[PDB]
C-alpha cells in the first residue's frame, strides 16, 4: 500500500488481530475486559458458527505468537449493529465477545471511547493502525504498520468520492495528493486520534475506493454516534 511505518512494540496495546481459519482476516480494538470493536464488513456471513474466529490480543508480529505478553483468545459471540445495510455502506461496526475475560499486562489495554460534546476539527493528524502491504495487491505485513492522516469533513468527502453517499454517520480521512492510505490490504481496525492524555477511538477503519489515490479519502466509522451502542457490553 505504501504510506505506513513500523510501530514499536507496546505503542498500540489496544490494536488486536482477528484470525478466521488460521488467516489474518480482520482487526479489532479492545474497549472492555471481554469485548472487542471491529469492522462489521469482515463479519458479514461468518457469525453463524462463532467458533472459527480466534482473537489475538497484543499481536505485533504475525509469525510469532509465543510471548507471554500476547494472550491468544477465542471468540464465542459476535454481534452486528442492526443499522448495517451493506448497501448504504453505513454503520459498519461489529463487536466480539472474548472467552472469559482479559488481563492488563501493559500490552493489552482498552481504547478510550468518544465522550459527549467532543469536537474533532478536520485537518488534525489521527493515527491509523493495521497490517498493510507493500503494494496495492500485496500481502499483510508481518509487522504492524502505523501512519497518520488528516481528518476530513463529510462535506468534502462526497465531492471527492461522488460514488459513495458517505452521510453524516461516517467520517472520512485522507490526503489531497494521496500516497498514504489503508483502504486495501486488511480490515485496518481502529482509527486513533490523540488528545494529550487519552487516545480516543476516533473511528473504525471501513471501506474505501482505492488506496493512495488522490481525492479518494478513506471512509471510517463514526464512533462518536456509536458510543451508546458500544457502552452496552461493559463490566
Amino acid at each position: 500500500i505504501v504510506g505506513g511505518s513500523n510501530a514499536k512494540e507496546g505503542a498500540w496495546p489496544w490494536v488486536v488481530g482477528l484470525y478466521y481459519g488460521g488467516r489474518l482476516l480482520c482487526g479489532a480494538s479492545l474497549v472492555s475486559s471481554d469485548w472487542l470493536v471491529s469492522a462489521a464488513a469482515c463479519v458479514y456471513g461468518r457469525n453463524l458458527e462463532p467458533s472459527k474466529w480466534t482473537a489475538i490480543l497484543g499481536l505485533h508480529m504475525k509469525s510469532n505468537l509465543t510471548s507471554p505478553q500476547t494472550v491468544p483468545r477465542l471468540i464465542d459471540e459476535i454481534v452486528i449493529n442492526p443499522h448495517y445495510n451493506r448497501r448504504r455502506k453505513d454503520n459498519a461496526i461489529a463487536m466480539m465477545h472474548l472467552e472469559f475475560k482479559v488481563n492488563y499486562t501493559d500490552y493489552i489495554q482498552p481504547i478510550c471511547l468518544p465522550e459527549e460534546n467532543q469536537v474533532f476539527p478536520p485537518g488534525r493528524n489521527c493515527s491509523i493502525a493495521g497490517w498493510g502491504t507493500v503494494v496495492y495487491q500485496g500481502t499483510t505485513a508481518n509487522i504492524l504498520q502505523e501512519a497518520d492522516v488528516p481528518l476530513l469533513s463529510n462535506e468534502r468527502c462526497q465531492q471527492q468520492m461522488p460514488e459513495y453517499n458517505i452521510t453524516e454517520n461516517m467520517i472520512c480521512a485522507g490526503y489531497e495528493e494521496g500516497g498514504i492510505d489503508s483502504c486495501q490490504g486488511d480490515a485496518g481496525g481502529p482509527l486513533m486520534c490523540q488528545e494529550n492524555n487519552r487516545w480516543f477511538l476516533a473511528g473504525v477503519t471501513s471501506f474505501g475506493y482505492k488506496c493512495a489515490l488522490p481525492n479518494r479519502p478513506g471512509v471510517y466509522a463514526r464512533v462518536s454516534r456509536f458510543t451508546e451502542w458500544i457502552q452496552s457490553f461493559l463490566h
Binding site: L48, H83, R88, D106, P110, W199
Partner: protein, 603 residues
C-alpha cells in the same frame, strides 16, 4: 596442465573449453578432437559420426533390458544440399525412450523435436547436420531400446505437391517449425490430455492409432505463439489450391491464421478462424497464385490452459479451388449474457399464503440473486422465520433478515453454509428477507413457514414481582444489585448507582438503589475506601477528592460502611449527624495510554 571446473581439455591439451561443447556437432577444439568417435563414447552403438549416405545405429542393450543409465547422442552429417530422412522400427516402450532430434547445431537446438512413448516415424531434416539425442527417463528395467537408419536425397528436386502434402503419419514430413515464436509444435498420437479441449482422435486414420500434430498439452498458464513454416515453392503457370484440416477445441482458443510471405515482402492473410468450434475437424481451402517464390506459414496463437489447436491432413492440389464439400465451421454458442442481474420472483411474502416455493428449490436458485420477500404482519405482531431445510456454499452467499420496515433496516442475523439454522424472531410487524448470492454454483436454497403471532420469541415475564434478567430467570431479592450471580448473562448486576444533579460524566451527587427505591447516601462515615467502592460500582477509575454541598435529600438515605470481607455495607436507615450530600467525583478508568516501556533513540 589443468582446466577450470565445468570445462574439459582437448586432445592437444592446448586450451580448455566447456564440456557441454563436446560431441554437439560443432567443432570447438583447435584440433577438432571434440567430434572424434573414440572421444565421444556413445556406448549405445559405439559410433558417433555417420558421414555416409546411409547407415544405422542402435541403443544400449537392444536385445535385453538395460540396468545402466548412459546418455547417448548421435550426429549425422551429409553433403550440402542433401536432406537426411530418418526411419524408425520399434518404439513401443513404457516411456524411458526420450528422443531429442534437432535441426542443425548451435542455438537451433531449442524445441525442434522431443519424442517419447510413440513411434517417431519417418523424420526429414533440411540441414547438413542432424543432432539426435537419446535421454533415459529412468534406470528401472522397463525399456528395451531402438535401432534407426537414415538416407540422404536431393532436397531441391521436390515439387510443390510433396512439400505440402503431409498426413502427419510420420512426423512433419517436409515441414519445418518456425523460430520467431515462443513455443513450437510436437507430435501426439491419439487423444490428448486436458479433457474438453484438443483432438480425441486422428483425422487421417480415424481413431487413436493415427499420428498428427497439435499445440503442447503441458498445463501452462501463459500465452504462447506457435508457428509452422513451409519450404519455398517455385512459381507455377497455374494457381494452386491448399487443402488442410484444422482442429480448434478449447474455451481459450484465440486465433488461427495463415500468412503468405514472398520475395516482395507482401505478407497477406487468406485464412483466419477465431473462437471454439468444438471437437470437430474443420476443412480449410484457400487459393494462392504468386509470380515469385513464396512460403506458407501456419500461425497459431495459444492462450493459457485449455486452448489447444491441432492441424492434420495438409495437402496441395493444382488449379482453382472446387466446391468445398465440408461447409464452414460452426462456433460453439456462448451462454446468454442477457440480463444476469436478478430474477425478482416473489417480491411480496405476506397474507395467509402457503409455504414459499420457487419451483426450483430441489435443484438450484437463479444466480446473482437480490430478491426480497417482505414478511408483513398485523400491528402489534412480530415475525418468526422457522427454516425447514438450509443448504448453502462457503461464505460468499448470505441470507439477510432485517426488521427496520424501511430503508433504515435493522439487521438481525446472517445465515449461510450447510447445516440446520436457528429461527429468527423480529421486534416489529415487518421483516425484510434478503437473499444475496454469487454468479456461480447455486445451491438448493431454503424454505420457511413465516408463521407468527403476538409476542413470539419473547420469554414470559416473571411473576410475584420478581426481577427478570435477559435470560428470563427470577431474581426476587437476593441478586438485586448486591454483587451476586443468578443469571448466566449477568444482567442481574446492572448498575444501580448513577450520578444525579451532575455537571460532567464523572462529577455528580451520589444516587443509590438497593432494590427498587432510588436514594442518596449520607456523609457520616464516608472515607476513601467507600469512595473507591462507589467508583467500582460506577465503573470508573481511582477515587478523586470530593466536597459536600448541602443535605437536599430528605428521603431514606443509605448509610455506607466498610466491612472486613470487602463487601460494602448498605444500611437504609435515616441515622446521620450533620448530614451533607457529597458531590462525589471519580477519575476515569485506565484508558488507552502508552503506559508501556516506550523509549526513543537520542540520535
Amino acid at each position: 596442465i589443468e582446466c577450470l571446473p565445468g570445462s574439459s581439455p582437448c586432445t592437444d591439451a592446448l586450451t580448455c573449453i566447456k564440456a557441454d561443447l563436446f560431441c554437439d556437432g560443432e567443432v570447438n577444439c583447435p584440433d577438432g578432437s571434440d567430434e572424434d568417435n573414440k572421444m565421444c563414447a556413445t556406448v549405445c552403438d559405439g559410433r558417433f559420426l555417420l558421414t555416409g549416405s546411409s547407415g544405422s545405429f542402435q541403443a544400449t542393450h537392444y536385445p535385453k533390458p538395460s540396468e545402466t543409465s548412459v546418455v547417448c547422442q548421435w550426429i549425422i552429417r551429409v553433403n550440402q544440399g542433401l536432406s537426411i530422412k530418418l526411419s524408425f522400427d520399434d518404439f513401443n516402450t513404457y516411456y524411458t525412450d526420450i528422443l531429442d532430434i534437432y535441426e542443425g547445431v548451435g542455438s537451433s537446438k531449442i524445441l525442434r523435436a522431443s519424442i517419447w512413448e510413440t513411434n517417431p516415424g519417418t523424420i526429414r531434416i533440411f540441414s547438413n547436420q542432424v543432432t539426435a539425442t537419446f535421454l533415459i527417463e529412468s534406470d528401472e528395467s522397463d525399456y528395451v531400446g531402438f535401432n534407426a537408419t537414415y538416407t540422404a536425397f536431393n532436397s531441391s528436386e521436390l515439387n510443390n505437391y510433396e512439400k505440402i502434402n503431409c498426413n502427419f503419419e510420420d512426423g512433419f514430413c517436409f515441414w519445418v517449425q518456425d523460430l520467431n515464436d515462443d513455443n513450437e509444435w510436437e507430435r501426439i498420437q491419439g487423444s490428448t490430455f486436458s479433457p474438453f479441449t484438443g483432438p480425441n482422435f486422428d483425422h487421417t486414420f480415424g481413431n487413436a492409432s493415427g499420428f498428427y500434430i497439435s499445440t503442447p498439452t503441458g498445463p501452462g498458464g501463459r500465452q504462447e505463439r506457435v508457428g509452422l513454416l513451409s519450404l519455398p515453392l517455385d512459381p507455377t503457370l497455374e494457381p494452386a489450391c491448399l487443402s488442410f484440416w484444422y482442429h480448434m477445441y478449447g474455451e481459450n482458443v484465440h486465433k488461427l491464421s495463415i500468412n503468405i510471405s514472398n520475395d516482395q515482402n507482401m505478407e497477406k492473410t487468406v485464412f483466419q478462424k477465431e473462437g471454439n468450434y468444438g471437437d470437430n475437424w474443420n476443412y480449410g481451402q484457400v487459393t494462392l497464385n504468386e509470380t515469385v517464390k513464396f512460403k506458407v506459414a501456419f500461425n497459431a496463437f495459444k492462450n493459457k490452459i485449455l486452448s489447444d489447436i491441432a492441424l492434420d491432413d495438409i495437402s496441395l492440389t493444382y488449379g482453382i479451388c472446387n466446391g468445398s464439400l465440408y461447409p464452414e465451421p460452426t462456433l460453439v454458442p456462448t451462454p446468454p449474457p442477457e440480463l444476469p442481474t436478478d430474477c425478482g420472483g416473489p417480491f411480496e411474502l405476506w397474507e395467509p399464503n402457503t409455504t414459499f416455493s420457487s419451483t426450483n428449490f430441489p435443484n438450484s436458485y437463479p444466480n446473482l440473486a437480490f430478491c426480497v420477500w417482505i414478511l408483513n404482519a398485523q400491528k402489534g405482531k412480530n415475525i418468526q422465520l422457522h427454516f425447514q431445510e438450509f443448504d448453502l456454499a462457503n461464505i460468499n452467499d448470505v441470507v439477510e433478515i432485517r426488521d427496520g420496515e424501511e430503508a433504515d433496516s435493522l439487521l438481525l442475523a446472517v445465515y449461510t453454509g450447510p447445516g440446520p439454522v436457528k429461527d429468527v424472531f423480529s421486534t416489529t410487524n415487518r421483516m425484510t428477507v434478503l437473499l444475496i448470492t454469487n454468479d456461480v454454483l447455486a445451491r438448493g436454497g431454503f424454505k420457511a413457514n413465516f408463521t407468527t403471532g403476538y409476542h413470539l420469541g419473547i420469554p414470559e415475564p416473571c411473576k410475584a414481582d420478581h426481577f427478570q434478567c435477559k435470560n428470563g430467570e427470577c431474581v426476587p431479592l437476593v441478586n438485586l444489585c448486591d454483587g451476586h450471580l443468578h443469571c448466566e448473562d449477568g444482567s442481574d448486576e446492572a448498575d444501580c448507582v448513577r450520578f444525579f444533579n451532575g455537571t460532567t460524566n464523572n462529577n455528580g451527587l451520589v444516587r443509590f438503589r438497593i432494590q427498587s427505591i432510588w436514594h442518596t447516601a449520607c456523609a457520616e462515615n464516608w472515607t476513601t475506601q467507600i469512595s473507591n467502592d462507589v467508583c467500582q460500582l460506577l465503573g470508573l477509575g481511582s477515587g478523586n477528592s470530593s466536597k459536600p454541598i448541602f443535605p437536599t435529600d430528605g428521603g431514606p438515605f443509605v448509610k455506607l460502611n466498610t466491612a472486613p470481607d470487602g463487601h460494602l455495607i448498605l444500611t437504609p436507615s435515616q441515622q446521620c449527624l450533620q448530614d451533607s450530600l457529597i458531590r462525589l467525583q471519580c477519575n476515569h478508568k485506565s484508558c488507552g495510554k502508552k503506559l508501556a516501556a516506550q523509549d526513543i533513540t537520542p540520535k
